[PDB]
Structure formats: C-alpha cells, structure tokens
Design a protein around this nucleic acid. Structure first.
Ligand SMILES: [Mg+2]
Ligand SMILES: [Mg+2]
Ligand SMILES: [Mg+2]
Ligand SMILES: [Mg+2]
Ligand SMILES: [Mg+2]
Ligand SMILES: [Mg+2]
Ligand SMILES: [Mg+2]
Ligand SMILES: [Mg+2]
Ligand SMILES: [Mg+2]
Ligand SMILES: [Mg+2]
Ligand SMILES: [Mg+2]
Lengths: 138, 345, 199, 190
RNA sequence: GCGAAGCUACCAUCUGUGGGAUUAUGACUGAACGCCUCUAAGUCAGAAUCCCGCCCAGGCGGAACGAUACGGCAGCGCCGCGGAGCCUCGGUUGGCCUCGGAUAGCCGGUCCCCCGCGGGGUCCGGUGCGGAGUGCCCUUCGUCCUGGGAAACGGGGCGCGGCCGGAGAGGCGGCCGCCCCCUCGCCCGUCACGCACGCCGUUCGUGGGGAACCUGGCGCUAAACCAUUCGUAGACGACCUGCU
RNA sequence: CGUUCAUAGCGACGUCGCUUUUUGAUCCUUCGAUGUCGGCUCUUCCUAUCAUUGUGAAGCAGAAUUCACCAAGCGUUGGAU
RNA sequence: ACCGAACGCCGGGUUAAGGCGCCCGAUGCCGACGCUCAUCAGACCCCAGAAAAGGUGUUGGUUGAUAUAGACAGCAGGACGGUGGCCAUGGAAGUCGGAAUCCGCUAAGGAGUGUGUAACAACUCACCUGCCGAAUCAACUAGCCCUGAAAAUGGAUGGCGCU
C-alpha cells in the first residue's frame, strides 16, 4: 500500500556506502536494481547506484528523466531541498544521533546530572497526577 | 536365507518387560473422560476376587441358534464391601503433564487406613495424621482448609477422591486396607468438589458406582508363576526328543549379524504377576450382603426370581482359599485376572 | 545477565546456530515459546523428515536407541545439541546453560524477551516460500500437550494485555506530566537536546 | 523475468459496498456479507473512486507464477460480489436406470439423506457447508437445488452429494447413477 | 481302582477397543493461456498406511501429603539477630512482560455509535529508515562541614500490623493504618577527610553455596531395616501379610 | 498382433538401464584352521504385492479379470516321494 | 598412493591446497548478478554413484509463420458436386489396403483426418464471417527442477541443519 516510489526525480537518502548520509535525486532507472543518480548540491557525482543502499524520502523534485546535471541542480535549488530536509523530523533525529556520538565525558556527566533532576521533577508530577486521578475515581 | 515356511511370531511385544509388577493393587492407568454435563459419579471401585461359579440364563440375541435357550456361563464373584472416602486430591493441567496440586485429608481416619502408612504397625506409635487432624478444630486450620478447597476450586481441573477399603469386613488375613485414588467425573469442578467434600468420612457402596448388565474393565495383577522357561513363558515349540542340550528352548536365538540378541527373541524369565487391564466384563448381578431386620437375610444373595430358595453365593464349605462372602459383591461374566483373595480394580 | 529469546517466528536451524555459539561463550540462554519456531520448506516435507528420524531405531533394543523427543522445546534442544561438542565436558557444560520451554512459563512471562533478527522468518525466507510451524509438526508426531499449552497462553496473553494497558496509561501520564511541568524543567530539557536526545 | 508492474480492476456495482481491512476484502450488500482473507497472495489491494466504484489490484515485480495470482484474486472478488447481489444456485439432477435415488433434506438444508441408491441399504447422510442450504425443487421431478452466497461452499457441497453417490466395483460406463450437477446459475438474475 | 487341593489344555471357559495427519485417488473455486484446466495462491473427501489413544514398562525427571527420633546420654524444625573458621567458586548496575504485522504498522482523541473504569467500531489529528527509538530506557560513582538559591514532604528505621493480586515451574510484588528519625536530587559559594611520596589482582552480587563451631525465643517428640510371621510371592534377594 | 484399431493387453528389428535371491570372472582377506549341504527351531528386515485395505484400467454388462498406483499392517498351511 | 608441501628444537610473521551458519580457526561483508522448490531437493579432483527417453515445471536462446486486407484459440454455420472416380468384388460410391490424385461450383470443402459401416447412411475433421479486443503460434535447442529411479540391522552432503 505504497506511498514512496522510485520515480524519476525522487530524492533519496543514501543509507550506507561511500556516499552515506547524503541526499541524492534519482535521475533515471537503469535496471531492476540499479539507478542512475545525482546529488549536485549534496556533493554526490553523477553515477549509477544500487537501490539496496538508498532509502527514499518524500521529496519528488521535477526534472526530465535524463537531464544534464545543470538542470537537476536548478530543480534542487528551486525547491530548496537542503532547507526542507533539515527541517524534517528524520533529519533532526539523524542530527540528534550524531550529537550523541560526539558527546565528551564532561558533556556526558553534565547530561547525567541534568537527567537525574529532570526525571525526578517528572516523577513527582506523575505520582501526584495518579493520586489525584485516584481522587476523581473515588 | 529367508525362513522357509511362514508362521506368525509367539507372544506379543505389546506387553513387555515381562517382569514382576512393581505394584500389587492394579493401577487405573486411564479414567474415562468427564463430559461436564451428566451428574457427578465415582468412576472406579476396589474389590476382592473371592471365587468362581456357574450361572444359568435365558439368552435374548435374535438370530442366534441360542436365542431363547438356557445357557450356562462361568462367573467370578468379587466381594466388594463399601469404600470409605478419606481424602480428595486436585490435579492441574500443565504442558509437562498433570501435576498434583493439593491433597486434603479428612478429620477422622480409621486404623484400617492408618495401617497402610506404616511398614510395621506393631512397632510404631501410630502417630500418622496426628498433627494434621488438629487443623479441623480451630479458626486458623478451618480457615486454611477452606482456602485450600477454594484454591482447588479455582485452579484444579481434575479431582480424584481418595477412598479405601473396609478390610475389617473381609475374611482375609490382612487388616491393612488399600487406599486408592478414584476420579470424580461430572459437572463443573466446584460442584464436583462440593460433592466430594460432602462424601468425606462416608461410606460408598458398590451399587452407587456400578449398575447391573454394565460392561466394566477389570484391572489387576496376574497370578504369578515364578521363573519359567521359554516354552511356558512364550509357548514356543518344544524341540524334538533327540536334542542334546535340552528341548524346552528356542534353538536359534538370532541370526549372526545384528550381533546382539534382540528384545524380540524369546527368553526365560518371570511368568506371571504382571499388571493387566482386561475389558468388557459384563456385571451379571450386583448382590446385597447379609443384613438383619429381625433375623438374617442370607437369601438376597444367590436366590433368583425363578429359584426362590434361601441360598448365599457362598458354596458349601465356603469359597475355597477365601471365606464367606458376607458383604455386597458384584458378579462378572467370565474369569478375571489374578489369584483368590486378590485386590482388584 | 540472561538472554531470553522468543522462539516464535524463528527458523529452527537458524536460531539454533546462534544459540549454540552463545551458549559456548558462557552466556546463559533461555528460549521460550518453542512451538512458535517455524522451519523452512512445506509442512509435508518436514513431517516426512521427522517420520524418517522416528524410523531410525536401535534394532535389537530400541530402549537404547535414538530418543525421539516429541515436544517442540525438546526438539529445539536436540537441534541445538547438534551444534555443540556434546560428548565433551565443555559441550555438556554449554548445554547446561541452555534452557528451553514449550510456551512461556512464569519466570520468563514477566521478562522482556529478545528476537534474533538473523534467524527470523520474515527476513530469511522469501514470502512465496512455504514453511512449517514446529507446534503442528510436534503435535502430529506425538506431542500430547499442544492444547494445554495453547490454553495457558491465552490466559497469559489476557494477563499481558492488562499489563500493557496499565503501561500505556502511565506513559500517557508521563507525557501529560512533562506538559504540566515544562517551565521548571526547561533548562534541563534544553541540555538533553544539545548533547542529542529528545529529538 | 520480473515484470515491473501488473494490475487489474474490478468495477463493483453501486448496490454493493466492499471494504478491505488491509488485504481482507469484506463484501456486503442485498443478501449478506462475505469476507475473504488474501493474506497469502501478496498484492496491493487499492480501492479507488468516489462512490467507491472500483477495486484495483496491483502486483509489483512479479515473476510468472506471482503474476497468475493477480487475476485470480480479482475473480474471487467478482464471485464474492455476485454472491452478495444475486447469489449462487447449483441445480443437480439425479440419474438412475432402476433405483430411484430417494433424496430428502432434514434440519433446514444442512442434511441430505440419499436412500436407495443402487438398491443399497446404506443411507448416505451428507452435511452442507455452513451457509449453504439444500432444497428439493418443484417444476422438475428428480432434481436438487443448492443456494448460497459463497460459491466455494456451494460447489463443494454439491460435490459432496455427487461423490457420495458413487459406484464401486462395477463398470461406470454402464452404471451411470447418482446426483450430478446439471446447471450452475444464480438465485435471481436481473 | 477311584481321587481333594494345586498346577493345567482351542482338550474347558472369558476378553481383544477410539481418534488425527494425510497417500494413491476423485473433487471444488481458479488463474497462468479473452476459453479450459484438481493447482500455480487457495479449498474438499480420503485408507489394512503413518502418529497418537487404549495397553505394558516407567528417566541420574518431577508431585502433593503424612510422620519426623523424650531420654536413660539425645538430636533437631522455624524465627531473628550476633562472633570466629575451613572449603567451593563463577561474577564486578539494573531493565517489572502487549499482541502481533510484514504488499504494513504505532499513538492519540473521540464529537458519535455498540459492548462488559475499561473492550470493539467508525471518523478525524499525529508519528513511521521507528526519539512513547534495546541506535533504547532507568540508576549514579567519592565522605563530610556550613549557608545561600532553584527543587521540596520525599526518604528511611532488614520500622512495624491489615487488605489484595499471583498456580504453568506462583515465588514475587502490590496496595492500606501507626511509631520514631532524617532535609537527602540540581546549581552555587565553604572548607576539610593518611596528600602513604608514578605502578598488579581495585571496585560489587555477598549477610553468597556447602561443612564444622558460640547466643536468645517458640516448637518437637521417629520411623526404617534386621529377626519373627505369612503365602495372593518366591532360585536367592525382592514382594504381599500378621504380631498389648 | 489384437475381427476393426501401433500402445486395453501385447510387442519384432533395434536400443538404454537396474539387481546381486543364478552362475561365471577375479584372487584382496583368512591355510599357529572363521566347523564344510540340507532339514528342524526362532527373530528381524526387504519388496521386485499372491491375498487382504483404499484406488485408477480394460478388448470392465454381471460374475470372473488381467493391467497399473499408494502400500510390507496382517497373513501366506497340512501331506505322498 | 588424491591436492599442497617434504620434517634438528623453538619465537614472530606469511602462505599453499583447502576453508570461513554452529560443531570448528575464519564473512557477525548492509558482499555483486542470476538461476532453482523437489510428497527421493542440492551441496566440490581422486570419490564412493545412474542412462536412454520424457515434462506449457520454470528460465534463457535459435529458426520460422500470420495478422487490422481484420488473426489466434472460445462461443457456432456449411463440408458439395463431375462420381459406385479407379484398382480391388470379399466388400471401400472419401473411408480393410494400394497406384492415384485433377477440374467444376467456387466462399469453399481433401477424389479425404477419423467415428463407424458388409456397403452406405449418419456423424466428425478447410475457406469465410458475428461477438469479443493485442499480441498470437509453431518447431527446435540448452540451463536448473521433476518422471524415468527397486533391497534386505536403523543412517548418514561428515553431523546438526540450511530455502
Ligand atoms: Mg516369507
Ligand atoms: Mg545326540
Ligand atoms: Mg509412545
Ligand atoms: Mg466385475
Ligand atoms: Mg491432490
Ligand atoms: Mg482433509
Ligand atoms: Mg479422517
Ligand atoms: Mg494390424
Ligand atoms: Mg565361529
Ligand atoms: Mg511398490
Ligand atoms: Mg598436479
């Protein structure tokens, strides 16, 4: 019951490989299992790329099936995909995950301390809510 | 080479390790399926083979050459004085099997029964269920019991009643009564359990359990015949007169090459005292025991509607190697397993 | 410190191999809901494969000969045993770390239990292939206690539904509690998304 | 090779209302409901149009045996639509050179006693599949009527009473007897 | 000659069972292949077969219950809290759980409808390379002092009594009264704690498992085997019985 | 051939196989010895199925029947030389 | 006895031939592209096992038709006359067999594919339409899979297993 399609001009996120963590517009479909692909604005050269390694987003920018790089660059910049991608929830949780990996040991300690308190303030709110709701039930 | 002239094999493999039965009282290996609809009842009883005799009867199978002709028919008498229920016991279904969950014993238990819990009674101080019966006369114990039944009512599926014989009432030498679990089959578990609870410390006669002209399955241990040769134990051929190293043998145990004698080859060993479950033994007559209103009622046993004498099923000079059947008895058609005096399920 | 795996949805051999190596490295493993293990190739295929295994018996004294366990748990235990050095001491020790159950009994029913996604049917087989539930197979080869195990699992699933419902209700209160409190946790919550959670 | 896409459409009539829980089409209308689970066929059951006018069945990257299912799902849906609207009426005529196969329904349709087939004392009782209701017709002397919504269940229950009345250990070219399916029609035609 | 008991004979007499999966096969719906086809997805019947049932044996496998050494020296069962002292070792935060799906799912909220605070439905709004994420969550890891802020009625006394839920191998929780004590998480100030002078098995589960030893309180008061006996048993052991 | 009709049942001239219940080849093992035929007795296994269960075939009207499939559960005897 | 490699006693490295789910050292690669489902799957020199011949099972090739002048299958309508054609009479006027083997009407039907007949008859098997709506169909060939394919203690891709 599909919503995302290997369409000409679909932007896709390259999961892994050399060009991992990059957006890429599908120029043309070569085969059952291989697409001819580009990412002018995302630092990805025109090349063939297997579907296995690319998972596909919800952004179909419009250019004709075998345009010459210049035109797909213009379609990318017209839609402002780089800004749109970053604003997406997906891109945010990628960013989140990256930050967690970068976290220094002082940073880590800071967080531990912050959570220690932050969960304690929630826990008391939850207990109170439960007892009051118990009051509503009574 | 192949065996020349075919013949079927001697004895069944579906009966072996032809060994001496570990039990003496025959185990009910499988009680019938309780359809939770018909009313509650005991499934099994525990009697004693007193002896054998004839019967005569008119027969009514139309078509036969023996239709409306009087035939004679061997019968076993099985003296079956009433059973006293002394416990109940809940079982729970598991994927492992059928775990026993909770056993409640009665308050009072007879010395008939107690006997069984000791290997030597003469020597013992007879202290069994002493600290147990305390439970039945206080707040804490009576409350603990009521919870245990209520737990059994919740969690258990199968309920068996523990009943034991009234060894007192038999001519036998032994006083040590047999206990036995008997499966209650009937309605919902609660209703079943309340019925058993009501029957506790109470008699249960035979006529409650079985009716007349009813097919039942007798379960007991066989008459034991010691070490017996292969010619007795398997009914193999006797070898001919000339055979140099004896002739009550099997000649070729096995072939050469599966170079091990098989479990399917006939060897000499224990003949008899095996556990056995015979089926479809028709109860011809449930009998009443001796009783008194002014004088004795000895008639009610072996008198019929057509004889009307004053006989007891006791033959002249008693049943041999047994005694006087004074109690209620059933009367099965044919023989049954085991020796005289033998406890019979 | 103890792997509990939900045998459901897993491939008989594929789970066994992963369990086997873990058990050899000293990890205590519990495999649960073994009847739910399912084996590639159609049902009839695997029935015949079992019925052949049943035929293998020590001709002269079958009582010694290969013990054909019917229970799905014991079947799984058998195939795991095939991937150990089970004549050695170390192999036996390893087998003793393993624990396998038909259905999911009371220590493990109230434990979150993992899934091997490398042995998982959805992943490893093509969707047009056929496979056999090791419950049915066991049932048809002798296993007595399918129905009993089934009923106990209904009760377990009902009891688990309640637990879940209460967990959901708490999670809902937590979400509301955060909304109630979001000005006096603001500069903690801020730092927990500089270093990259909550996002 | 893998076929990049194949599909079909099934135009539901405005009388019927079909709905699909994922891959489990439920068809309801004049005569009743009929559900059927195609979890095992692996297809995109779209349901498009305002007024819900057509059922569309895609099948992406199919090989030749996968693409055969596409149509069959569509056909079963057609029969499901028919069953809801018109219904199915399988007529089956009894045949005999001597022993006049005495049929008699019992509970409602359910049971079919088939006495005196080939002079046999053995009375063949035959159940029907739930929903199917046998009935002995008028306007035709030796003849049964099986009606029901779900075709599968009707046609199988016909086959039950066809195979019930079978001749053993004889020359079946000679001994042509039994109740055989003569006409597969509907309850109402329009 | 005749013959009790006892063995014993198709040479007498009695008893011998019910399901499930399907094979061959014949069928159903139905594509592939506008039709047709038992088949490709799906469905049906189906057997001296196969597996189980009944039946026999019962695992270096479990069960519930009974009784648990009065004594003439005894010896133990619980409970709680203390001191040493062999031995056996592995370990070196926890995770207290929906079901499941996969050509789909998760969460909400129902304005509205049906069922027993929930369950089911429809409708709508959110997520979905899953952030109500095991790529996860929880917990913190020096001790103390005093003297501010934000957070603040939370924690304890192996604190104490009642009411629950839990049977699959429950073995664990939960919720309610009363007594006494404390001010613990997050920031700041403020000092001090052998600072053992660069250097290894640290750091816990641990009051661990087992064996032998000193204290209190409340409980207990034997069976088994031999010998003897029996004959439903028996080669001998074993077995069934009897004995203020 | 089977009135007719290659194939119900067969099948020439040719051809491809399997089997080790025939007999040959062979000589590896055993000549400081593996007791040499048959019968009797007893168990088990195989199927290349005579009978029995369930079925497809006919040159199967019935009866009798051969041909084939699943199939080795159960059977497969008494005598004369 | 094959393949690799030829041995004083040791440390580090590196290989060969072989391997790398687990047994078992190594793929716990986000390996690449295909093929194949087997109610007897298949799985590595020597080597421990199968053939002829089949199969719209599936996958590739090769060569050819026929077709909007309206196919191809599917629903249906005719299948004649010159003519007992000739040989064969034992009957073959299409029809046990065989030499023949063309014309007319033609829209078009073979001096006939069969069924069946003593022999006919009767039936059946082009050319064309009516409906429907794009590919259709034939003969070869070679991959995997299946049939062919039967043995005696219970059993062996080394085992577990594996789609
Ligand atoms: Mg023979
Ligand atoms: Mg002699
Ligand atoms: Mg068994
Ligand atoms: Mg016949
Ligand atoms: Mg079939
Ligand atoms: Mg069936
Ligand atoms: Mg059946
Ligand atoms: Mg001929
Ligand atoms: Mg010898
Ligand atoms: Mg055969
Ligand atoms: Mg070489």
């Amino acid at each position: 019951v599909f919503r995302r399609f290997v369409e000409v001009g679909r932007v896709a996120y390259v999961s892994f490989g050399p060009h991992a963590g990059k957006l890429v517009a599908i120029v043309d479909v070569i085969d059952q299992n291989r697409a001819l692909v580009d990412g002018p604005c995302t630092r990805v050269r025109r090349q063939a790329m297997p579907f296995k390694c690319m998972q596909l987003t919800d952004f179909i920018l419009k250019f004709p099936h075998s345009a010459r790089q210049k035109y797909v660059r213009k379609a990318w910049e017209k839609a402002d995909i780089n800004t749109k991608w970053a604003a997406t929830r997906w891109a945010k949780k990628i960013e989140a995950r990256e930050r967690k990996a970068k976290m220094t040991d002082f940073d880590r300690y800071k967080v531990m301390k912050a959570k220690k308190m932050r969960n304690r303030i929630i826990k008391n709110e939850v207990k109170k809510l439960q007892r009051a709701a118990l009051l509503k039930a009574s | 080479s192949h065996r020349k002239f075919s013949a079927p094999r001697h004895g069944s493999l579906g009966f072996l390790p032809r060994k001496r039965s570990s039990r003496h009282r025959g185990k009910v290996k499988s009680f019938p399926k309780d359809d939770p609809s018909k009313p509650v009842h005991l499934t099994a009883f525990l009697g004693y083979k007193a002896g054998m005799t004839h019967i005569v009867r008119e027969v009514d199978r139309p078509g036969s050459k023996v239709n409306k002709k009087e035939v004679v028919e061997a019968v076993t008498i099985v003296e079956t004085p009433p059973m006293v229920v002394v416990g109940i016991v809940g079982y729970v279904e598991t994927p492992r099997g059928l775990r026993t969950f909770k056993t409640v014993f009665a308050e009072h238990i007879s010395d008939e029964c107690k006997r069984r819990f000791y290997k030597n009674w003469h020597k013992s101080k007879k202290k069994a269920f002493t600290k147990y019966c305390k439970k039945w006369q206080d707040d804490a114990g009576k409350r603990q019991l009521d919870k245990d039944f209520s737990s059994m009512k919740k969690y258990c599926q199968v309920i068996r009643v523990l009943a034991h014989t009234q060894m007192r009432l038999l001519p036998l030498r032994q006083k040590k009564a047999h206990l036995m679990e008997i499966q209650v089959n009937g309605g919902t578990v609660a209703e079943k359990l309340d019925w058993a609870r009501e029957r506790l410390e109470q008699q249960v006669p035979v006529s409650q359990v079985f009716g007349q002209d009813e097919m039942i399955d007798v379960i007991g241990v066989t008459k034991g015949k010691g070490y017996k040769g292969v010619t007795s134990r398997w009914h193999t051929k006797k070898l001919p007169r000339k055979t140099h190293r004896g002739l009550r043998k099997v000649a070729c145990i096995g072939a050469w090459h599966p170079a091990r004698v098989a479990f399917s080859v006939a060897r000499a060993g224990q003949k008899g005292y095996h556990h056995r479950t015979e089926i479809n033994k028709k109860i011809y007559k449930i009998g009443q025991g001796y009783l008194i209103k002014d004088g004795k009622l000895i008639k009610n046993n072996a008198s019929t509607d057509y004889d009307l004498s004053d006989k007891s099923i006791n033959p002249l000079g008693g049943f041999v190697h047994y005694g006087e059947v004074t109690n209620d008895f059933v009367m099965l058609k044919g023989c049954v397993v085991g020796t005289k005096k033998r406890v019979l399920t | 410190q103890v792997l509990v795996l939900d045998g459901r949805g897993h491939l008989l051999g594929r789970l066994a191999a992963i369990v086997a190596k873990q058990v050899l490295l000293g990890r205590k493993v519990v495999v649960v809901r073994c009847e739910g293990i399912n084996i590639s190739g159609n049902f009839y295929r695997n029935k015949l494969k079992y019925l052949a295994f049943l035929r293998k018996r020590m001709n002269t004294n079958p009582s010694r000969g290969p013990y054909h366990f019917r229970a799905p748990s014991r079947i799984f235990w058998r195939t795991v045993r095939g991937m150990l050095p089970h004549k050695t001491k170390r192999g036996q020790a390893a087998l003793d770390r393993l624990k396998v159950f038909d259905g999911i009994p009371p220590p493990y029913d109230k434990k979150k239990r993992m899934v091997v996604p490398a042995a998982l049917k959805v992943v490893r087989l093509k969707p047009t292939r056929k496979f056999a539930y090791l419950g049915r197979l066991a049932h048809e080869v002798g296993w007595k206690y399918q129905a009993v195990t089934a009923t106990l699992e209904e009760k377990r699933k009902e009891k688990a539904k309640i637990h879940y419902r209460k967990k959901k209700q708490l999670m809902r209160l937590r979400k509301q509690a955060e909304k109630n409190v979001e000005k006096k946790i603001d500069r903690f919550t801020e730092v927990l998304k500089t270093h990259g959670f909550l996002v | 090779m893998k076929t990049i896409l194949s599909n079909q459409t099934v135009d539901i009539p405005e009388n019927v209302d079909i709905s699909l829980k994922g891959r489990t089409v439920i068809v309801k209308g004049p005569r009743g409901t009929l559900r059927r689970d195609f979890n095992h066929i692996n297809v995109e059951l779209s349901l498009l149009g305002k007024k819900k006018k057509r059922l569309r069945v895609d099948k992406w990257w199919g090989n030749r045996k996968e693409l055969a299912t596409v149509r069959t799902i569509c056909s079963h849906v057609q029969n499901m639509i028919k069953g809801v609207t018109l219904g199915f009426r399988y007529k089956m005529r009894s045949v005999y050179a001597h022993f006049p196969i005495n049929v008699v329904i019992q509970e409602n349709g359910s049971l079919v006693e088939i006495r005196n087939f080939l002079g046999e004392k053995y009375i063949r009782r035959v159940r029907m599949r739930p929903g199917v209701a046998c009935s002995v017709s008028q306007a035709q002397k030796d003849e049964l009527v099986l009606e029901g919504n779900d075709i599968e269940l009707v046609s199988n229950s016909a086959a039950l009473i066809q195979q019930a009345t079978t001749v053993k250990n004889k020359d079946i070219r000679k001994f042509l007897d039994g109740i055989y399916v003569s006409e597969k029609g509907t309850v109402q035609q329009a």
